[PDB]
Write a protein that binds this ligand. Structure first.
Ligand SMILES: [Zn+2]
Ligand SMILES: [Zn+2]
Lengths: 146, 77, 69
């Protein structure tokens, strides 16, 4: 598994995701940290969000376990940083890379999946009163991620 | 002058008559005749080798009743 | 399963350009000469050994998410 973790690390260097950084924290290659800048033209614009990335022993046959460390107001992300994303659990494939996951997360922030939510109350605001949904998200971006 | 099998597609079957001297590119056209597949859609594989369109059944050493493997490429998988 | 032995395999030869798959997406390694390649029903091929492990637990083409039994 090591060999493929290193492969991805170069792939990130040659084609870095838009305003995103990721890599191992220390000598252990299986534990990385990542940062994502809140997408422009989203409620999160201007925020910096930190993530943990943990590669399973038999990666890439098991997907990586990814989670936020920064609090975020979002229908698919909970107060524990858990992320409701399909590629991370049941649509996982060896063909997927760390870059693709980061870009999926990045697009999830732009466009939640309120029909299959992780936080009902915020999903319900997103569909029915989007204007309130963004102000709160902007507020949270301003408060814990700046 | 020789029986050959190309049972593949998962809907496998097909029995063909051929001469050892037949080039692979004759084979793909006879598969177009038993089946509707355009030849350029066809990828023939045998004993661990792709078969080159120009080479023949004798070249590759396909003996009677050899049962061979067809793979269908698509217009944009 | 036994199904994994019912799919075609063929040692890669760089000289002949019949498929446009120059890479095994599970290993992220170019196809090297004589390496064993396994092709799935959907005409997607990877390193045989490399994709073999994935079929034990799953049954979908890693690239296009198509079943392969
Ligand atoms: Zn490989
Ligand atoms: Zn496929």
């Amino acid at each position: 598994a090591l060999k493929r973790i290193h492969k991805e690390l170069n792939d990130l260097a040659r084609d870095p995701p838009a305003q995103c950084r990721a890599g191992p924290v220390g000598d252990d290659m299986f534990h990385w940290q990542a940062t994502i800048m809140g997408p422009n033209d989203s409620p999160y614009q201007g925020g910096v969000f930190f993530l943990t990335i943990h590669f399973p022993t038999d990666y890439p046959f098991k997907p990586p376990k990814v989670a936020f460390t920064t609090r975020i107001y979002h229908p698919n992300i909970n107060s524990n940083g858990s992320i409701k994303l399909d590629i991370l659990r049941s649509q996982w494939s060896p063909a997927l890379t760390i870059s693709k996951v980061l870009l999926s997360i990045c697009s999830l922030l732009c466009d939640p999946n309120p029909d299959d939510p992780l936080v009902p109350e915020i999903a319900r605001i997103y569909k029915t009163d989007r204007e309130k949904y963004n102000r709160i998200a902007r507020e949270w971006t301003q408060k814990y991620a700046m | 002058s020789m029986q050959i099998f190309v049972k593949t597609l998962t809907g496998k079957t097909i029995t063909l008559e051929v001469e050892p001297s037949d080039t692979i590119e004759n084979v793909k056209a006879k598969i177009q005749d038993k089946e509707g597949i355009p030849p350029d859609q066809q990828r023939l594989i045998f004993a661990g080798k792709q078969l080159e369109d120009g080479r023949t059944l004798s070249d590759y050493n396909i003996q009677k009743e050899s049962t061979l493997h067809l793979v269908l490429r698509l217009r944009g998988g | 399963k036994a199904d994994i032995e019912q799919l075609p395999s063929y040692r890669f030869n760089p000289n002949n350009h019949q498929s446009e798959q120059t890479l095994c997406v599970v290993c992220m390694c170019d196809f090297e000469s004589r390496q064993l390649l396994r092709v799935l029903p959907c005409n997607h091929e990877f390193h045989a050994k490399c994709v073999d492990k994935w079929l034990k637990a799953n049954r979908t083409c890693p690239i296009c998410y198509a079943d392969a039994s």
